[PDB]
Design an enzyme around this catalytic site. Structure first.
Site, PDB file in Angstrom:
ATOM      1  N   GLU A 752       0.912  -1.201  -0.085  1.00 29.32           N
ATOM      2  CA  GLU A 752       0.142  -0.125  -0.015  1.00 29.32           C
ATOM      3  C   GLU A 752       0.755   1.166   0.120  1.00 29.32           C
ATOM      4  O   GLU A 752       1.708   1.535   0.844  1.00 29.32           O
ATOM      5  CB  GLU A 752      -1.009   0.116   1.124  1.00 29.32           C
ATOM      6  CG  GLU A 752      -1.707  -1.560   1.487  1.00 29.32           C
ATOM      7  CD  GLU A 752      -2.569  -1.674   0.182  1.00 29.32           C
ATOM      8  OE1 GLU A 752      -3.713  -1.132   0.094  1.00 29.32           O
ATOM      9  OE2 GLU A 752      -2.113  -2.650  -0.394  1.00 29.32           O
ATOM     10  N   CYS A 786      -1.699   9.296   4.021  1.00 35.54           N
ATOM     11  CA  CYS A 786      -1.804   9.027   2.610  1.00 35.54           C
ATOM     12  C   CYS A 786      -2.848   9.100   1.943  1.00 35.54           C
ATOM     13  O   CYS A 786      -3.126   9.341   0.789  1.00 35.54           O
ATOM     14  CB  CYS A 786      -1.643   7.086   2.679  1.00 35.54           C
ATOM     15  SG  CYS A 786      -2.671   6.539   3.652  1.00 35.54           S
TER      16      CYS A 786
HETATM   17  N1  LIG Z   1      -1.729   3.489   1.058  1.00 34.08           N
HETATM   18  C1  LIG Z   1      -1.819   3.273   2.359  1.00 34.08           C
HETATM   19  O1  LIG Z   1      -2.627   2.819   3.120  1.00 34.08           O
HETATM   20  C2  LIG Z   1      -0.520   4.080   3.235  1.00 34.08           C
HETATM   21  C3  LIG Z   1      -0.589   4.173   4.672  1.00 34.08           C
HETATM   22  C4  LIG Z   1       0.504   4.625   5.354  1.00 34.08           C
HETATM   23  C5  LIG Z   1       1.648   5.168   4.537  1.00 34.08           C
HETATM   24  N2  LIG Z   1       1.515   5.129   3.123  1.00 34.08           N
HETATM   25  C6  LIG Z   1       2.819   5.672   2.248  1.00 34.08           C
HETATM   26  O2  LIG Z   1       3.647   5.674   2.862  1.00 34.08           O
HETATM   27  C7  LIG Z   1       4.914   6.781   2.727  1.00 34.08           C
HETATM   28  C8  LIG Z   1       5.350   7.497   3.982  1.00 34.08           C
HETATM   29  O3  LIG Z   1       5.906   6.811   4.994  1.00 34.08           O
HETATM   30  P1  LIG Z   1       7.394   6.292   4.740  1.00 34.08           P
HETATM   31  O4  LIG Z   1       8.531   7.572   4.707  1.00 34.08           O
HETATM   32  O5  LIG Z   1       7.609   5.328   6.123  1.00 34.08           O
HETATM   33  O6  LIG Z   1       7.564   4.919   3.601  1.00 34.08           O
HETATM   34  P2  LIG Z   1       9.096   4.429   3.065  1.00 34.08           P
HETATM   35  O7  LIG Z   1       8.926   4.027   1.595  1.00 34.08           O
HETATM   36  O8  LIG Z   1      10.053   5.633   3.091  1.00 34.08           O
HETATM   37  O9  LIG Z   1       9.523   3.481   4.008  1.00 34.08           O
HETATM   38  C9  LIG Z   1       8.492   2.788   5.078  1.00 34.08           C
HETATM   39  C10 LIG Z   1       9.111   1.453   5.525  1.00 34.08           C
HETATM   40  O10 LIG Z   1       9.845   0.571   4.654  1.00 34.08           O
HETATM   41  C11 LIG Z   1      11.337   0.438   5.342  1.00 34.08           C
HETATM   42  N3  LIG Z   1      12.243   0.328   4.185  1.00 34.08           N
HETATM   43  C12 LIG Z   1      12.799   1.717   3.581  1.00 34.08           C
HETATM   44  N4  LIG Z   1      13.625   1.100   2.351  1.00 34.08           N
HETATM   45  C13 LIG Z   1      13.518  -0.219   2.361  1.00 34.08           C
HETATM   46  C14 LIG Z   1      13.936  -1.250   1.391  1.00 34.08           C
HETATM   47  N5  LIG Z   1      14.967  -0.959   0.409  1.00 34.08           N
HETATM   48  N6  LIG Z   1      13.554  -2.689   1.400  1.00 34.08           N
HETATM   49  C15 LIG Z   1      12.796  -3.134   2.451  1.00 34.08           C
HETATM   50  N7  LIG Z   1      12.145  -2.118   3.237  1.00 34.08           N
HETATM   51  C16 LIG Z   1      12.699  -0.781   3.294  1.00 34.08           C
HETATM   52  C17 LIG Z   1      11.361   1.382   6.109  1.00 34.08           C
HETATM   53  O11 LIG Z   1      12.673   1.573   6.884  1.00 34.08           O
HETATM   54  C18 LIG Z   1      10.105   1.571   6.846  1.00 34.08           C
HETATM   55  O12 LIG Z   1       9.973   0.971   7.950  1.00 34.08           O
HETATM   56  C19 LIG Z   1       3.766   7.702   1.591  1.00 34.08           C
HETATM   57  O13 LIG Z   1       4.200   7.652   0.251  1.00 34.08           O
HETATM   58  C20 LIG Z   1       2.352   7.249   2.130  1.00 34.08           C
HETATM   59  O14 LIG Z   1       1.337   7.573   1.299  1.00 34.08           O
HETATM   60  C21 LIG Z   1       0.329   4.614   2.245  1.00 34.08           C
END
Ligand SMILES: NC(=O)c1ccc[n+]([C@@H]2O[C@H](COP(=O)([O-])OP(=O)(O)OC[C@H]3O[C@@H](n4cnc5c(N)ncnc54)[C@H](O)[C@@H]3O)[C@@H](O)[C@H]2O)c1
Ligand SMILES: Cc1cc2nc3c(=O)[nH]c(=O)nc-3n(C[C@H](O)[C@H](O)[C@H](O)COP(=O)(O)OP(=O)(O)OC[C@H]3O[C@@H](n4cnc5c(N)ncnc54)[C@H](O)[C@@H]3O)c2cc1C
Ligand SMILES: Cc1cc2nc3c(=O)[nH]c(=O)nc-3n(C[C@H](O)[C@H](O)[C@H](O)COP(=O)(O)OP(=O)(O)OC[C@H]3O[C@@H](n4cnc5c(N)ncnc54)[C@H](O)[C@@H]3O)c2cc1C
Ligand SMILES: NC(=O)c1ccc[n+]([C@@H]2O[C@H](COP(=O)([O-])OP(=O)(O)OC[C@H]3O[C@@H](n4cnc5c(N)ncnc54)[C@H](O)[C@@H]3O)[C@@H](O)[C@H]2O)c1
Lengths: 983, 52, 125, 63
Positions: A752, A786
């Site tokens: 997501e 989001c």
């Molecule tokens: N569609 C939904 O339901 C929903 C809900 C909450 C957040 N979001 C999205 O999340 C974003 C903001 O939150 P964020 O900055 O934490 O997202 P992010 O992609 O920066 O990282 C989130 C998570 O993934 C991990 N991660 C980072 N790089 C990785 C890799 N290379 N391999 C595996 N895991 C990795 C992180 O360390 C962390 O715990 C927005 O774009 C937002 O809309 C979507």
């Protein structure tokens, strides 16, 4: 000389039955008392059914109109009444209306209310598909009946409303002959200032109305002078409990100034009663105003009290004590209440422990008479004013008065006319005040809506009296006889908020911020919870692999644990969460930087996830499914856990999304290795420990902390059975590639990701509600949701007003420490977030019009910003902050707007604000967005209610908190047994 | 899994067919979870309060 | 049962919440030679039933039956614009799955080819 | 062309006539009644009779 009463704080939603146990016996009347009441009331209803022109209810009934249809015709009626040449209107009505241009007419007439110049010769082609509210009406009734209905709306609007483009125009139009007194008091249209400028305009309008009324007041003493009605929400842009500090300092001097102006003309000055969550605050404001020595020697000050509230009797006690303490005479209006449906919805949404209003109409009727009796005995200090159009209520209050002196009745122009004329005929000493709605076109829509809900209500007395199927004796049933028994007080088909989802699951509990005892206790509880915020050591790649191996070993036993036992663990977790809400809310504020309402809401969501997945879990994994087949053979389908799930979560919902993903995987029979966002490991660790305490085996759930590299090590591990991810679209693709690279099984990826979420608002939308919902959707939680609104499309005819109102509203948001209850917008998550946001803001300032750039406190803060783009194509990324982008469009170019939305590739949330069902439905048909919100804000999806999640670049599905989620975490198994040998 | 009979000729709607691990992703063809995977969910939420 | 009508969700008064299932887009259906008719039609009609259009690529060894099947589907009520047959080898199959506009892939065949398809999908932006 | 008839006669013959007349104006199934009831949409008054019957065996009233 008596003590000024303490700040009002009655219990918000006490038990209906116990109230009924008091009101039912006390309602008893002797046979001769009932006989007088019966006679008076029959005579009133006979007069009512004489049948004069009519009222709104008559129009709704005559053409069988919905409230929406009534509203649309009344709006068109006002536009038509304001055309300079009546012959011009006539020609439009006969030649154009109902012939075509259905949506155009509805759109233009509504835009007219905010943008007069918008409404001004087209050419209508024949054979046009009848769409829009008017077109649908035309298809159903025929064009001629719609014209007739519109003409009737015109006499109603012209006779029962005093309207103008500005207050000055309304007031000039409403004036009497000469050297004469107005036969009406003023029910001023204004409510809910959204901006500082709105609050000043409403103040000025009241001030102007008071002078107009004053100069035409007559020479008699109170009570025989005119009145004005005023709404506190009109005089302050954040009239709400959490902003109480600034309200007491800003609003009181304003209300005082207006009261003084009314006093100088010796007028009746009434503060209206609004929503239940504003009751306490309103009484605080009213008391501080009344205390000012400048209001001595004047008997016209007063307020309305709503008898449909359980707190009504206590408000009366408070008002009386107020009067004695300041030695004043007050005029006090008793009403039933105008916001019933709103109170029900709010209490359900807010998961309150009950309703502040009665839920059976007869209970409101009982409490009204009980309150009337109370007020009558408070004469002469209190001058009661009984506002009602109910003949039985009137007859009953009259009997209890035993006289006609020292009180009045009230009614709204266009209602109760036959009733009160007859009452006057039968009782020469009786007084009644008639109010006229008075104001500007820009305030009409908000008012019309509320008005139409009540005239179109089946339970309303006025409606029933107008329906000759209802016999007179039926209108005369005593309320006590409808209730009969105390335990029958509450409505049998309206569940308490905690039972909203019964028998499926329990609902999480919320808090009413408008109840000072509840808000003060919550604040104290959270404050009591301490947290130094000790650093949480990162995991090494070795520890991460050890975690997977350990989870892998624990999978065999967990997967084979009965579903009921897994479900019970989730449900115990929900229990512990709510039980420790203060602790977790404290964490959400400290580590998450969330305001109080956002934290509480996330806590609720976390517990909802547990109970909902537990409930769906039993349905799905509780027993096998028998497949139909031949005799002598059994075929059974089961769902088994897949193995070890890796759960990766974001920082913006560090508790609920964390737990949602984890408990889903666990419920399906998987073991889990969870890696939280680097910013929010503490709450994640607390959650995991809580799950273990709730019954999740240590061998089934492991927490591994670290950056995206540790997350990468987990997703790359050859032994994992799947990945549930919420985060950036970019990181998801990276994870997907790492999975696809492996030579092993192709495992499921649930991802997501972000969105560039749009809202479409047309000219039939109420600008005040658009502004509320836009401000909430884009700036709530500093835009760190989001689902947040990023791109507003607004039709050009209303763009200037809508944009100006959003900007003015945004300026009223308090930005600062999330632990201060007055804060609306807390800090963004980290320095990196702020820098990225600041860079986009800098770029937008040189590329697009700046409508608003708010003031931000030093630190990790970014204030609301509003930019207007020339075209949507200028917005190409999800910018994760309080930054609204706006594009205005021509109605004929909606297609262009829809292409602009399709073009980004995202598809998470979409907002639509419109009165027009055909427009709303065309938009829904066209777009593929996961969550569409109509005529409300775009945020705060509720588990099991709004299954949440998008497609395209916004996600894979299935939707979290919906019925298709759990299955994805499991694998199917068919067992086929040849049973023939058994016979 | 087939007990005391041959292992072939899965019948649509009777033996939902398909495997896991190296044998497949699911959902099983000819079973009640198959069609959903070909679709996307959409939630429509309407504030109906203005009507009642 | 699934796409016939929406599912009403429980919620507060004054609000409606409805869950629907919609087609995703263009599905690429790739089928094997060993069940040239039934598995071909199974995958194709599932995708069609869910409201997707389909481009179907049959096993190179068994195009005739697949073409006869597509003709029958058209005759049965599937619009020409909703269903297309593309014949060829694994390279033509690879072209289809690599296309940036497709919305999904349903495949039956060798574990090895599945992985290459999975990698081609994952590679796209 | 359309012909308009007026009821013409003595008071002693009114009652018998009024009764028959009122049965039809007060009938739910009557077109005139329904047309006068704005709850009934125009398209409803326009349903073809064949589409109400659909099948021969459904000709007789089931109740
Ligand atoms: N569609 C939904 O339901 C929903 C809900 C909450 C957040 N979001 C999205 O999340 C974003 C903001 O939150 P964020 O900055 O934490 O997202 P992010 O992609 O920066 O990282 C989130 C998570 O993934 C991990 N991660 C980072 N790089 C990785 C890799 N290379 N391999 C595996 N895991 C990795 C992180 O360390 C962390 O715990 C927005 O774009 C937002 O809309 C979507
Ligand atoms: C001049 C004037 C000023 C007013 N000022 C205000 C104000 O400042 N604030 C305010 O909130 N109202 C105010 N009202 C009241 C409101 O606008 C309605 O007119 C009023 O509530 C209708 O009561 P009734 O006795 O005339 O009609 P009735 O048909 O006898 O009762 C209608 C009402 O009963 C209640 N009700 C309906 N269903 C239920 C149920 N299932 N369970 C419990 N109760 C139910 C409601 O309060 C509702 O409006 C004012 C009315 C007038 C005439
Ligand atoms: C000038 C004039 C002269 C007339 N002279 C005669 C006469 O000499 N003798 C006579 O019998 N009528 C006579 N009628 C007809 C009768 O008086 C009614 O006006 C007529 O039957 C209504 O038909 P409609 O198409 O106007 O109304 P509609 O609403 O379309 O149809 C109403 C009628 O359908 C029929 N009907 C109702 N329910 C059912 C059912 N469940 N099953 C089957 N049929 C049903 C009835 O015949 C009934 O009157 C005359 C009418 C007019 C205007
Ligand atoms: N699990 C089941 O339900 C099921 C059912 C039938 C067949 N199978 C499997 O099918 C296999 C045997 O039949 P097969 O020789 O047709 O399988 P295969 O892997 O050789 O290829 C089958 C299909 O994929 C296409 N294809 C080949 N390379 C491709 C590529 N690089 N990109 C996209 N498409 C490509 C083919 O041209 C063809 O239409 C076995 O391994 C068997 O078990 C499984």
């Amino acid at each position: 000389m008596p003590n000024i009463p303490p700040p009002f704080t009655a219990p918000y939603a006490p038990d209906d039955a116990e109230i009924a146990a008091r009101l039912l016996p006390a309602s008893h009347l002797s046979p001769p008392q009932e006989a007088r009441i019966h006679r008076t009331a029959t005579r009133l209803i006979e007069a009512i059914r004489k049948r004069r022109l009519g009222g709104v209810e008559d129009m709704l009934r005559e053409f069988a109109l919905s409230t929406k249809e009534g509203l649309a015709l009344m709006v068109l009626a006002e536009a038509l009444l304001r055309v300079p040449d009546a012959r011009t209107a006539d020609q439009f009505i006969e030649d154009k209306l109902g012939e075509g241009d259905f949506i155009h007419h509805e759109t233009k007439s509504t835009a007219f209310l905010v943008n007069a110049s918008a409404w001004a010769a087209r050419v209508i082609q024949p054979g046009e598909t009848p769409d829009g509210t008017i077109g649908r009406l035309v298809k159903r009734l025929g064009a001629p009946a719609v014209r007739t209905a519109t003409r009737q709306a015109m006499r109603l609007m012209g006779n029962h409303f005093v309207l103008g483009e500005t207050i000055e125009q309304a007031l000039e139009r409403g004036k009497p002959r000469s050297g004469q007194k107005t036969r009406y008091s003023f029910d001023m249209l204004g409510e809910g200032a959204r901006t500082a400028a709105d609050a000043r305009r409403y103040f000025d309008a009241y001030a102007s109305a008071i002078e107009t009324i004053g100069k035409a007041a007559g020479n008699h003493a109170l009570p025989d002078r005119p009145g004005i009605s005023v709404k506190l929400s009109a005089l302050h842009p954040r009239f709400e409990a959490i902003s109480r500090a600034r309200v007491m300092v800003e609003l009181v001097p304003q209300l005082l100034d207006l009261a003084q102006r009314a006093k100088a003309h010796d007028l009746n000055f009434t503060v209206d009663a609004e929503e239940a969550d504003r009751l306490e605050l309103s009484l605080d404001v009213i008391a501080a105003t009344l205390a000012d020595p400048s209001l001595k020697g004047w008997d016209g000050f007063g307020l309305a009290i709503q008898a449909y509230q359980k707190r009504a009797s206590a408000v009366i006690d408070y008002v009386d004590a107020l009067a004695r303490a300041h030695d004043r005479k007050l005029m006090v209006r008793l009403v039933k209440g105008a916001y019933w449906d709103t109170e029900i919805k709010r209490a359900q949404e807010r998961g309150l422990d009950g309703y502040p209003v009665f839920t059976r109409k007869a209970m409101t009727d009982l409490n009204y008479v009980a309150c009337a009796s109370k007020l009558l005995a408070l004469r002469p200090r209190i001058f009661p004013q009984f506002a009602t159009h109910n003949a039985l209520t009137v007859a009953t209050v009259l009997e209890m008065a035993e006289g006609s002196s020292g009180f009045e009745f009230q009614r709204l122009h266009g209602m109760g006319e036959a009733l009160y004329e007859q009452l006057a005929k039968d009782h020469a000493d009786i007084a009644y005040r008639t109010y006229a709605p008075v104001g500007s076109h820009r305030d009409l829509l908000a008012y019309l809506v509320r008005r139409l809900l009540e005239n179109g209500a089946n339970s309303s007395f006025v409606a029933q009296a107008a329906d000759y199927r209802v016999p007179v004796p039926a209108l005369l049933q005593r309320p006590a006889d409808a209730i009969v028994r105390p335990q029958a007080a509450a409505h049998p088909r309206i569940p308490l908020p905690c039972d909203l989802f019964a028998p499926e699951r329990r609902n999480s509990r919320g808090v009413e911020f408008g109840a000072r005892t509840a808000l003060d206790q919550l604040l104290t509880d959270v404050k009591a919870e301490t947290g130094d915020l000790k650093p949480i050591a990162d995991a090494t790649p070795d520890q991460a692999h050890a975690a997977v191996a350990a989870a892998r070993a624990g999978f065999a036993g967990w997967s084979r644990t009965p579903a009921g036992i897994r479900a019970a663990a989730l449900e115990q977790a929900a229990h512990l969460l709510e039980s420790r809400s203060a602790h977790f809310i404290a964490l959400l504020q400290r580590e998450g930087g969330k305001t109080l309402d956002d934290a509480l809401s996330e806590l609720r969501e976390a517990a909802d996830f547990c109970r909902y997945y537990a409930a769906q879990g039993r349905k799905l994994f509780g027993s096998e499914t028998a497949m139909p087949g031949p005799t002598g053979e059994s075929n059974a389908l089961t769902m088994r856990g897949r193995g070890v799930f890796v759960a990766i979560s974001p920082w913006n919902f560090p508790l609920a999304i964390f737990l949602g993903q984890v408990t889903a995987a666990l419920m399906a029979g998987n073991s889990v290795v969870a890696k939280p966002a680097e910013q929010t490991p503490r709450i994640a660790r607390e959650a995991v420990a809580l799950l273990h305490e709730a019954g999740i085996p240590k061998s089934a759930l492991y927490l591994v902390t670290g950056d995206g590299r540790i997350g990468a090590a987990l997703t790359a591990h050859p032994d994992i059975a799947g990945v549930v991810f919420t985060g950036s679209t970019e990181v998801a693709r990276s994870i997907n590639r790492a999975l696809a690279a492996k030579d092993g099984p192709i495992v499921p990826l649930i991802a997501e990701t972000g969105g560039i979420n749009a809202m479409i608002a047309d000219a039939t939308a109420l600008p005040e509600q658009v502004a509320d919902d836009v401000v909430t959707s884009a700036f709530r939680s500093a835009g760190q949701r989001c689902s947040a609104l990023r791109l507003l499309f607004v039709q050009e005819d209303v763009a200037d007003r809508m944009i100006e109102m959003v900007a003015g509203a945004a300026r009223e948001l308090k930005i600062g420490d999330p632990s201060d209850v007055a804060t609306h917008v807390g800090p963004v998550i980290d320095v990196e977030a702020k820098q990225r946001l600041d860079a986009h803001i800098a770029r937008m300032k040189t590329e697009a019009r700046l409508h608003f750039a708010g003031p931000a406190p030093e630190g990790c803060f970014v204030a609301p910003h509003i930019f207007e783009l020339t075209e949507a194509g200028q917005l190409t990324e999800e910018v994760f902050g309080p930054i609204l982008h706006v594009v205005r469009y021509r109605p004929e170019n909606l297609e262009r707007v829809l292409r602009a939305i399709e073009r980004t590739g995202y598809g998470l949330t979409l907002g639509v604000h419109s009165r027009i069902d055909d427009s709303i439905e065309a938009i829904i048909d066209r777009v593929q967005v996961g969550n569409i919100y109509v005529n409300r804000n775009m945020i705060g999806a509720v588990v099991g209610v709004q299954p949440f999640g998008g497609n395209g670049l916004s996600g894979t599905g299935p939707k979290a908190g919906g019925p298709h989620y759990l299955a994805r975490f499991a694998t199917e198994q068919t067992v086929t047994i040849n049973t023939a040998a058994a016979g």
